[PDB]
Each structure stands twice: as structure tokens, then as C-alpha cells.
From TrEMBL, chains B, C:
Shown segment, full-protein numbering: 362 to 412 of 566
Domain of life, per lineage: Viruses
Organism: Escherichia phage EC6098
Family (UniProt): Belongs to the microviridae F protein family.
Lineage: Viruses, Monodnaviria, Sangervirae, Phixviricota, Malgrandaviricetes
UniProt name for this protein: Major capsid protein
Gene that specifies this protein: vp1
Annotated compartments: Virion
From TrEMBL, chains D, E:
Residues of the full protein shown: 30 to 39 of 39
Species name: Escherichia phage EC6098
Name assigned to this protein: Putative DNA binding protein
Source species, domain of life: Viruses
Gene that encodes it: vp8
Amino acid sequence: QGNAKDDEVFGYQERYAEYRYRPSQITGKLRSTDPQSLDVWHLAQRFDSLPALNQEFIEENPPMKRVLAVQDEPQFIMDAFFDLKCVRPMPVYSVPGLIDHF
Amino acid sequence: RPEYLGSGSFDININPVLQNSATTDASPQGNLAAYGVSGGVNRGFSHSFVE
Amino acid sequence: RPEYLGSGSFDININPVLQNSATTDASPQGNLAAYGVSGGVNRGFSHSFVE
Amino acid sequence: ARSMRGGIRL
Amino acid sequence: ARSMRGGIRL
Amino acid sequence: EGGEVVDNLTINSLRQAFQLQRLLERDARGGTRYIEIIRSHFGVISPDARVQ
Amino acid sequence: EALPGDTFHLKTSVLARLSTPVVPFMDNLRLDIQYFSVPYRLVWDNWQKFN
Amino acid sequence: FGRKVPSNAKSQHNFSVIPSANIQRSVFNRSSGYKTTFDAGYLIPVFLD
């Protein structure tokens, strides 16, 4: 920002971590800060104010609303099917009866 | 602690789609839209329960 | 009782169709419609009639 | 799948 | 050493 | 006045009474700590460590 | 709900469709499924006394 | 059409894995004597560690 805040601590990380890590970057007309931005092409977060290391920062929150053509419908429609083979302590069909038994 | 029995994961494959309709003010012929799909079979877990 | 001579069955396969026409207020490019079709050959029954 | 920094979160 | 009647007591 | 009214016995009520008695007899004979319940009502030998 | 002495073997099939993107956006996007066992005695203190 | 490029997400995950602790285990004898008087039927705690 150029504010004095810029030199204040976000959080702590291992010594020389920036030689080991290399965060991925958006550079050109793709940035969400551009007045005529192409940020429809990618899912990089846009911070509107200074992120702190807290719950709001680390919770997964991709900007799906901008890469998707239809507004106000759920992002994923899913069909799922669960095929269980069960061994269970019961018969496969129970016929009523057997009063003294079990 | 609740036991972690297993996991699976899939790519959401994003596949390009060509506009074969003619040029418009909205989008030119040869413009490149997409659709997204994901799926497969997992072999999730096998486990036996003591309680 | 009337005798049950045999049977056959087929899936109605529902096949996705991509919109290659440009984006509209109705539907975006890359929207996914469908068509449905079913069929095959059965080998239905073989039988001889006494009456 | 190993021991992550900051404790476990999947 | 087996399952005793009245529940376990050693 | 001041009696107690009870309905006719269905066979389903009667067999449920028998199987409830079998359950309470299994509890007396087998024990009622949660590990004793598991071992008496099911075939299962739970480890002690996982049941505290 | 699993009983004492159950054994489960689970296969999962998934089909997830992403609602239509504007462009083939460049970022990877994983779908995943994780399964957990939770004994009833971890979620209710009276579970043993109920039994 | 083109082929997608990889993400760095796996290498970034690997840099975050802490090393295992080096423990310095050893084997030794921890012998001890205990002497007492007691009466029948009680549960007497003779060993504690």
C-alpha cells in the first residue's frame, strides 16, 4: 500500500523460506486491479483491504462468481453413488417368528 | 478422535468449446468458451467396526 | 394364467450436447443440453402353441 | 500426507 | 479367563 | 368405578414381550458395561484402550 | 450407521458438473471426498448409559 | 486445443512438511525392590511407575 502498515508483520515463517517457496503470480492485464481486467481467466483472490493471518484469510474462498457465466446458481451440480458391500450381524431378510430363539 | 477411514480426489477437467456460430457484437466466431466436469470411481475404504 | 413368454429391456441413453452458438440471455456458450435415444435387438422368445 | 507445520488440518 | 456371568470381575 | 382397562393381546405384542425378556436376561447374564454389552450382544472383542 | 462387528467395503462413483464457465480459466480445481468413523460415545456422554 | 500447464500446489505442500524429531532412545535396567505387610482380600498397589 505504501502505508507504514506494509513493514508490519503478517505472520512468521521459517528462516529463508522465500528461497524454498515460490508463490504463483498474475502480472499483466489479468490482474483484478486493472480498470479493464481479464481476471475472468483465473481464480486468484482479490483483497479489497489488508488481509491479517486469521480465520477469514485461511478459509477456502475461491472467487467462482467471476469465472462462471450464469449468475446466482450453485457452482457444482453433483450425482454421487455409494456401493457398499456390507457384512452385518443380521440376516439379509428377516421373517417374523422364532420366539424362544436369539 | 474420530478415525480417518480414507479419501479420494478428482480433477475438475475444464474443456474448451469453440463458437461455430458467426461473429456477433457479443463474441467472434472461433471464440473459446468452456465446460467443466469431474468424476470417476474411488475404492474409498475398507473397515471393520468394533463399536 | 396367461403364460409369460419372455422379455427384453434397453437403457434410454441420455447424451450431452454442447451449445457452440455464442452466449445469449437464454443460455451461455458451453451450456450443456441433451438428447435421448434407446434401442437394440432383443431375441424376444421362442415358443410352440398347443391351442 | 506427512506431519504438516502448524499441526494437522486436512 | 473367558466371558464370566454377571459381567467381568477379575 | 376405578378399574384398569387393557386391550386384547396381539401375537406381535406377545412375541415382542418374549424378545424383550431375552434382551434383559442377556444383560443380566452377560453384564452391562459397554464392553460387556458389545461382547454379549455381538461377536465382537473390542480393545479396552478405545473404550476408555 | 455401523454396528459392532460390521465390515464395510465402499466404492464411490461421482459425476460433478461445474455450471458453465465464461472461458477455459487456467487454474486447477480438485474435487475430493474424505470418510470418517465417529463412535457414538464421542458425541453423547450418556450413550453408554443409554445402552 | 492446447494442453493445461501444472500447478505448483504439490511442491508448496512439500516445503511445509516438518522433519521428524530425532529421539535418542536407549535401553537400561530399572530394577527396584519393595517390602510390605498386608492382609488377605485387599487389593494392594505394590508396583507403581
